[PDB]
Enzyme design. Sequence first.
Site, mmCIF file in Angstrom:
data_model
loop_
_atom_site.group_PDB
_atom_site.id
_atom_site.type_symbol
_atom_site.label_atom_id
_atom_site.label_comp_id
_atom_site.label_asym_id
_atom_site.label_seq_id
_atom_site.Cartn_x
_atom_site.Cartn_y
_atom_site.Cartn_z
ATOM 1 N N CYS B 65 -3.285 -6.017 -1.079
ATOM 2 C CA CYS B 65 -4.185 -6.240 -2.315
ATOM 3 C C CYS B 65 -5.330 -6.995 -1.532
ATOM 4 O O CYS B 65 -5.436 -7.966 -1.121
ATOM 5 C CB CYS B 65 -4.460 -6.528 -3.368
ATOM 6 S SG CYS B 65 -5.773 -6.162 -4.345
ATOM 7 N N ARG B 68 -8.327 -8.805 -4.158
ATOM 8 C CA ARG B 68 -7.628 -10.656 -4.834
ATOM 9 C C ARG B 68 -8.923 -11.449 -4.643
ATOM 10 O O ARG B 68 -8.588 -12.728 -5.930
ATOM 11 C CB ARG B 68 -7.083 -10.954 -3.682
ATOM 12 C CG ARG B 68 -5.896 -10.398 -3.614
ATOM 13 C CD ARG B 68 -4.756 -10.768 -3.336
ATOM 14 N NE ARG B 68 -4.573 -10.338 -2.149
ATOM 15 C CZ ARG B 68 -3.777 -11.390 -0.430
ATOM 16 N NH1 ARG B 68 -3.255 -12.529 -1.372
ATOM 17 N NH2 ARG B 68 -3.576 -10.410 0.393
ATOM 18 N N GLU B 242 -9.608 4.768 -0.289
ATOM 19 C CA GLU B 242 -8.477 5.477 -0.760
ATOM 20 C C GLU B 242 -8.152 7.327 -0.806
ATOM 21 O O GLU B 242 -7.370 7.797 -0.764
ATOM 22 C CB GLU B 242 -7.900 4.496 -1.610
ATOM 23 C CG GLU B 242 -7.411 3.089 -1.483
ATOM 24 C CD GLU B 242 -6.977 2.493 -3.215
ATOM 25 O OE1 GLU B 242 -6.226 2.807 -3.630
ATOM 26 O OE2 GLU B 242 -8.359 1.249 -3.374
HETATM 27 C C1 HEM Z 1 -11.055 -4.997 -8.168
HETATM 28 C C2 HEM Z 1 -10.385 -4.233 -7.911
HETATM 29 C C3 HEM Z 1 -9.412 -3.487 -6.346
HETATM 30 C C4 HEM Z 1 -9.188 -3.059 -5.131
HETATM 31 C C5 HEM Z 1 -10.515 -2.966 -4.854
HETATM 32 C C6 HEM Z 1 -8.246 -3.162 -4.559
HETATM 33 C C7 HEM Z 1 -7.733 -2.847 -3.438
HETATM 34 C C8 HEM Z 1 -6.512 -1.895 -3.048
HETATM 35 C C9 HEM Z 1 -6.157 -1.223 -2.498
HETATM 36 C C10 HEM Z 1 -7.123 -0.957 -1.512
HETATM 37 C C11 HEM Z 1 -4.771 -0.995 -1.828
HETATM 38 C C12 HEM Z 1 -4.036 -0.582 -1.075
HETATM 39 C C13 HEM Z 1 -3.847 0.647 -1.309
HETATM 40 C C14 HEM Z 1 -3.188 1.839 -0.971
HETATM 41 O O1 HEM Z 1 -3.714 1.917 -0.014
HETATM 42 O O2 HEM Z 1 -2.080 2.489 -1.754
HETATM 43 C C15 HEM Z 1 -4.920 -2.378 -3.275
HETATM 44 C C16 HEM Z 1 -3.253 -2.941 -3.093
HETATM 45 C C17 HEM Z 1 -3.011 -3.333 -4.233
HETATM 46 N N1 HEM Z 1 -3.321 -4.166 -5.255
HETATM 47 FE FE1 HEM Z 1 -5.559 -3.921 -5.217
HETATM 48 N N2 HEM Z 1 -7.548 -3.305 -5.873
HETATM 49 C C18 HEM Z 1 -7.917 -4.014 -6.663
HETATM 50 C C19 HEM Z 1 -7.588 -4.317 -7.595
HETATM 51 C C20 HEM Z 1 -6.221 -5.140 -8.515
HETATM 52 C C21 HEM Z 1 -5.905 -5.493 -9.193
HETATM 53 C C22 HEM Z 1 -6.788 -5.470 -10.183
HETATM 54 C C23 HEM Z 1 -4.253 -5.619 -8.898
HETATM 55 C C24 HEM Z 1 -3.315 -6.040 -10.080
HETATM 56 C C25 HEM Z 1 -3.829 -7.177 -11.544
HETATM 57 C C26 HEM Z 1 -4.137 -5.224 -7.811
HETATM 58 C C27 HEM Z 1 -2.696 -5.017 -7.515
HETATM 59 C C28 HEM Z 1 -2.390 -4.541 -6.138
HETATM 60 C C29 HEM Z 1 -1.332 -4.642 -5.828
HETATM 61 C C30 HEM Z 1 0.267 -4.675 -6.374
HETATM 62 C C31 HEM Z 1 -1.064 -3.692 -4.169
HETATM 63 C C32 HEM Z 1 0.064 -3.255 -3.538
HETATM 64 C C33 HEM Z 1 0.619 -1.859 -4.316
HETATM 65 C C34 HEM Z 1 1.875 -1.495 -3.230
HETATM 66 O O3 HEM Z 1 2.388 -2.878 -2.401
HETATM 67 O O4 HEM Z 1 2.260 -0.483 -3.192
HETATM 68 N N3 HEM Z 1 -5.266 -4.368 -7.756
HETATM 69 N N4 HEM Z 1 -5.403 -2.930 -4.326
HETATM 70 N N1 LIG Z 2 10.561 2.093 -2.646
HETATM 71 C C1 LIG Z 2 10.053 2.825 -3.998
HETATM 72 N N2 LIG Z 2 8.939 2.480 -2.594
HETATM 73 C C2 LIG Z 2 7.569 3.430 -3.054
HETATM 74 C C3 LIG Z 2 7.779 5.182 -3.399
HETATM 75 C C4 LIG Z 2 6.793 5.616 -3.677
HETATM 76 C C5 LIG Z 2 5.648 5.139 -3.282
HETATM 77 C C6 LIG Z 2 5.016 4.339 -3.043
HETATM 78 O O1 LIG Z 2 3.595 2.987 -2.479
HETATM 79 C C7 LIG Z 2 3.121 3.108 -3.888
HETATM 80 C C8 LIG Z 2 1.854 2.195 -2.637
HETATM 81 N N3 LIG Z 2 0.409 2.756 -3.158
HETATM 82 C C9 LIG Z 2 0.648 3.268 -4.241
HETATM 83 C C10 LIG Z 2 0.840 2.158 -5.508
HETATM 84 O O2 LIG Z 2 0.195 1.225 -5.258
HETATM 85 C C11 LIG Z 2 -1.177 1.126 -5.303
HETATM 86 C C12 LIG Z 2 -1.962 2.485 -5.036
HETATM 87 C C13 LIG Z 2 -3.865 2.542 -5.184
HETATM 88 C C14 LIG Z 2 -4.286 1.345 -5.649
HETATM 89 N N4 LIG Z 2 -6.006 1.220 -5.570
HETATM 90 C C15 LIG Z 2 -6.417 1.098 -6.134
HETATM 91 N N5 LIG Z 2 -7.526 0.425 -6.031
HETATM 92 C C16 LIG Z 2 -5.674 -0.129 -7.590
HETATM 93 C C17 LIG Z 2 -5.288 0.850 -8.018
HETATM 94 C C18 LIG Z 2 -4.369 -0.665 -9.419
HETATM 95 C C19 LIG Z 2 -5.010 -1.686 -8.743
HETATM 96 S S1 LIG Z 2 -6.082 -1.922 -8.017
HETATM 97 C C20 LIG Z 2 -2.896 0.118 -5.089
HETATM 98 C C21 LIG Z 2 -2.111 -0.031 -5.327
HETATM 99 C C22 LIG Z 2 2.288 3.535 -4.084
HETATM 100 C C23 LIG Z 2 6.083 3.332 -2.589
HETATM 101 C C24 LIG Z 2 9.237 3.105 -5.212
HETATM 102 C C25 LIG Z 2 8.720 2.563 -5.597
HETATM 103 C C26 LIG Z 2 9.219 3.003 -7.270
HETATM 104 C C27 LIG Z 2 9.382 4.210 -7.304
HETATM 105 S S2 LIG Z 2 9.717 4.575 -5.994
HETATM 106 CL CL LIG Z 3 -5.039 6.337 -5.304
#
Ligand code: HEM
Ligand SMILES: N=C(Nc1cccc(O[C@H]2CN[C@H](COc3ccc(/N=C(/N)c4cccs4)cc3)C2)c1)c1cccs1
Ligand SMILES: [Cl-]
Lengths: 362, 362
Positions: B65, B68, B242
Site C-alpha cells: 500500500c 500508508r 488504479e
Molecule cells: C487512503 C487512501 C489509500 C490509497 C490512495 C491507497 C492506495 C493503494 C493502492 C494503489 C494499492 C494497490 C492496489 C492494486 O494495485 O490492486 C493499495 C493496496 C493496498 N492497500 Fe491501500 N490505499 C489507501 C488506503 C488504504 C486503507 C485505508 C487500507 C486498510 C485499512 C489499505 C490497505 C491496503 C492493502 C491491504 C493493500 C494490498 C491489497 C492486496 O494485497 O491485494 N489501504 N493501496
Molecule cells: N489467492 C488470492 N489471490 C488473489 C485472487 C484474486 C485477486 C487478487 O488480487 C487482489 C489485488 N488487489 C485487489 C484488492 O486489493 C486492493 C484493490 C484496490 C485498492 N485500492 C484502493 N485505493 C483501496 C481499496 C481499499 C482501501 S484503499 C486497494 C487494495 C484484489 C488476489 C485470493 C484472495 C481472495 C480470493 S482469491
Molecule cells: Cl479497484
Amino acid sequence: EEKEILWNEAKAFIAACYQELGKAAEVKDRLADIKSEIDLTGSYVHTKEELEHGAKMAWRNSNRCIGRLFWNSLNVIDRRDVRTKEEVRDALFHHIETATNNGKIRPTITIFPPEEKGEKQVEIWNHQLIRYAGYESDGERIGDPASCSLTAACEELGWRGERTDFDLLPLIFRMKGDEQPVWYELPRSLVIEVPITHPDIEAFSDLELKWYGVPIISDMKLEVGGIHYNAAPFNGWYMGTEIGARNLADEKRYDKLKKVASVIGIAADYNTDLWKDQALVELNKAVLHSYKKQGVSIVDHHTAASQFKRFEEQAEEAGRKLTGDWTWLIPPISPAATHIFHRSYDNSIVKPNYFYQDKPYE
Amino acid sequence: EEKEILWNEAKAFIAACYQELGKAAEVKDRLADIKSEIDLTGSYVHTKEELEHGAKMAWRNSNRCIGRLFWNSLNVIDRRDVRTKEEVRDALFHHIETATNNGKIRPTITIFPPEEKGEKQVEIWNHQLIRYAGYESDGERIGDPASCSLTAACEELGWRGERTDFDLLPLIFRMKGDEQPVWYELPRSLVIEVPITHPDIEAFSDLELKWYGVPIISDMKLEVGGIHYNAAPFNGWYMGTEIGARNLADEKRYDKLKKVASVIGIAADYNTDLWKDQALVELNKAVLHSYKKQGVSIVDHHTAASQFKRFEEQAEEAGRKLTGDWTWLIPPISPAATHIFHRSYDNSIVKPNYFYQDKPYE
Ligand code: HEM
Ligand SMILES: N=C(Nc1cccc(O[C@H]2CN[C@H](COc3ccc(/N=C(/N)c4cccs4)cc3)C2)c1)c1cccs1
Ligand SMILES: [Cl-]
Ligand code: HEM
Ligand SMILES: N=C(Nc1cccc(O[C@H]2CN[C@H](COc3ccc(/N=C(/N)c4cccs4)cc3)C2)c1)c1cccs1
Ligand SMILES: C[C@H](O)[C@H](O)[C@H]1CNc2nc(N)[nH]c(=O)c2N1
Ligand SMILES: C[C@H](O)[C@H](O)[C@H]1CNc2nc(N)[nH]c(=O)c2N1
Ligand SMILES: [Cl-]
C-alpha cells in the site's frame, strides 16, 4: 580451494555447452584434458567454440535483459591474443566500427585475455565505450552526472573535456604491469550520434538533445566455466525507454522533463495534470522517431516485450528453465501494458553470466 | 497448538500496541487476563482501543500500500455486536454512506465478529462492496471480466443483472448456520459514480466511461493479535492509475485503450508511435479531472508517492522498520518518475496485517 572452484565450474560448463552443441561424446576426453591443464598450469584455455557459445549462454542467462531472444546470434570476437595497449585500443576501435555497422547495429562482444590469478591483463575504466562526460563544480553542472567520477579521473590523467553537455569521453584502460591507465580520444568518424527531433512538434529541436547510437558496456565480467574475462565489452541496440525515460529524464541524469513540457506546450505546474507522464511519452516518441529517421537500430518497449515473450516460449520449448529479474525487465514507461508486468520470474543466477566488478577508480 | 499460536500472537501484539499507546505498565495485567480467558474460553476479546489501534497497525504494515502515510487516521467502526443478516446489511450500507461522505472520502473499516474455531460468523462474498458485474457467454463479453465468477454465483441465487457494462453487484454474504448467502441490491442513492470526461477533448465523453467513487475491499482478513477478523471491509480513496491504467485499460478488464486512441485522434497501428502510452496518459488525466470535477476524493501517483516518501521518513523517525513490496508500490504509469522505483524495500510480513483468504465460491 580456487583450483577446486575452477574445476567444478569447468565440469558443469563443458557438460552443458557440449550437450547444446551436440558434442556430448567429447565431454569425457575434454574434461580429462582440462583437469591435466589445471593441475599443470593452474588454469585452462577455452576452445573458440567454447568461448563463443559461453558468451552466448551468458547473455541468455542475463536475468535483467529484455533483449535475450537474439542470444544465439551474438557476434563473438576473440581477442585473447592481444598483448599491447595499441592492440587493445585498435580492438576497441574495431568493435565500435563493426558493431555500429553504419547504423544497422550488430550485437557483438570482444573478449580480451582473462584474469590469471585474479590478476587482470587488461583493465578497462570506461563504463561504456561511448559515453558522455559529466562535470559538477560550484553548483554548476554540465553533461552526464553519471560520468562525473570517471570524467574527473580522466582529467587527472591529462585529458581535458570541452565542457559541452555531450563531450565524448576517451577510451581509458590499464595494462597489467602499468601503474596508470592510458587514454585515447575516440575518432568522431567512428561514433554515430542521433539528434532528437519529434515527428509532429517542430520546436522539439530547440532542446538540442542528442544521444549516441550504440551502447557498449565495457565494465562487466564475463564468467565462463570458471574463467573470469573481466575485459569483454559487449553491445546490443537500445530500447528507446533507456534513453527517453531514464538517460534524458532522470533528475540525476540529463533531467529534461520540464524543458520537454515547455516545448510541447503544456504547463509543468500540477501533479494532477500528469505533465511528467505526457512529457515522458513525447520524449520517448521523439527518441524512437529520431533513431528510425537516421537508420540507427532501436526497439520500442512494446516490441521488445513481445520479443521477450517469444524468448520465454523458446526456453520452455527447449526444456530450459527461464530466469529473470522482474524489477529490471518491466519497462519504465507503461509497464502494465506489457505481459512482463503480469507474470513473475525466478531471479536465480545461472552461469555463464555477466557480473558487476569493482571500478578501478573512485 | 492453535491455542499456543494465539497466546504467542497475543503477547506480541499487546506488548507492541500498549508501547505505542503509552500503556506499557498495563501490559502485564492485561496479558494475565488474556491468558486466563484463552484457558477458559479458547479465545480472547479485544478492548475497543486494541481493536482500533490493531486495525491501524495492520494498514501501516500493508507492504503493498502506497497510501500508508495516513494509517493513524483510519476510522474504525466496531460491529462485533452484529448477529443478524439485517444488521450486517445495514452495517454495510452505513459503511458505504459514512465512508463516501458526499465525496470527501473517509478511510474507514467496519469490523464484524471474528472467526471462532476457524468458523466464520459472517462470510462476505463480494470482493468490493461496490463493484460492477461481468458476463461472458458465447464470445459475448459485457461489463467487468474480473467479476464473472461472482456474477455467475449471484445469478445462481436468483439475482439478475441488466447486462449493461456497469451493473452494480448486490451485497452478498452468508451467516454462520445458513447454507446459502443472502443478497441485497445496493440503493443507488448510496453509490456515487463519476462519468469520465477529459479536460480538453470533448469527444472523450463519447466513450461513455464511468467508475464508482469508493473502493471498499471486503474479502480480506484482518489479523490482530492472533484473532482472525475475516469480515472487516475497509476503504480509502483511489489512486487514479488504479482506474485509468488498470481497471479501464487492462486487456482482461475493460480494455479501452484502442477506443481511447481513436477519440483522442491518434492512430493505434504502430508500436513505435507509443499510442498505448499516449492513450494511457490521456485516460489517466481524464480520470483525475473527472473525480476532481465531481468533488470525489482521488490522488494522482506523483502526489501519492510523495506522501509515501513522508511515510518512510515518519517510520525512520519513529524508529520503526519500514516494510514494502516494491513490485506493488511502483505505479503502473511513469514508475521511474517516482522515488519508489529508485530504492528497495524489505518485503517482510509483520502483523497485525490484512491477508488474502479463499473465496467461498469458485
Ligand atoms: C487512503 C487512501 C489509500 C490509497 C490512495 C491507497 C492506495 C493503494 C493502492 C494503489 C494499492 C494497490 C492496489 C492494486 O494495485 O490492486 C493499495 C493496496 C493496498 N492497500 Fe491501500 N490505499 C489507501 C488506503 C488504504 C486503507 C485505508 C487500507 C486498510 C485499512 C489499505 C490497505 C491496503 C492493502 C491491504 C493493500 C494490498 C491489497 C492486496 O494485497 O491485494 N489501504 N493501496
Ligand atoms: N489467492 C488470492 N489471490 C488473489 C485472487 C484474486 C485477486 C487478487 O488480487 C487482489 C489485488 N488487489 C485487489 C484488492 O486489493 C486492493 C484493490 C484496490 C485498492 N485500492 C484502493 N485505493 C483501496 C481499496 C481499499 C482501501 S484503499 C486497494 C487494495 C484484489 C488476489 C485470493 C484472495 C481472495 C480470493 S482469491
Ligand atoms: Cl479497484
Ligand atoms: C540486442 C539488443 C538488446 C537490447 C534491446 C537489450 C535490452 C536491455 C535493457 C533495456 C537492459 C536494462 C538496462 C538498464 O536499465 O540499465 C538490459 C540489461 C542487460 N543486457 Fe541486454 N539488450 C540487448 C542485448 C544485449 C547483449 C548483446 C548482451 C550481452 C551479450 C546483453 C546483456 C545485458 C546485461 C548483462 C544486462 C544487465 C546489466 C546490469 O545488470 O546492470 N544485452 N538489456
Ligand atoms: N556495484 C556496482 N553497481 C553498480 C554501480 C553503478 C552502476 C550500476 O548499474 C549498471 C546498470 N546498467 C548499467 C549497465 O548495464 C546496461 C546498460 C545499458 C544497456 N542497454 C543496452 N541496450 C545494452 C548495452 C549493451 C548490450 S545491450 C544494457 C545494460 C550500469 C551498478 C558496480 C558495478 C561496476 C562498478 S560499480
Ligand atoms: C506478477 C506481478 O507481481 C503482478 O502483475 C503485479 C505487479 N505489480 C502490481 N502492482 C499493483 N499495485 N497492482 C497489481 O495488480 C500488480 N500486479
Ligand atoms: C531500486 C531499483 O531496483 C532500481 O531503481 C532499479 C529498478 N528497475 C530498473 N530497471 C532497469 N531496466 N534499469 C534500472 O536502472 C532499474 N533501476
Ligand atoms: Cl545507457
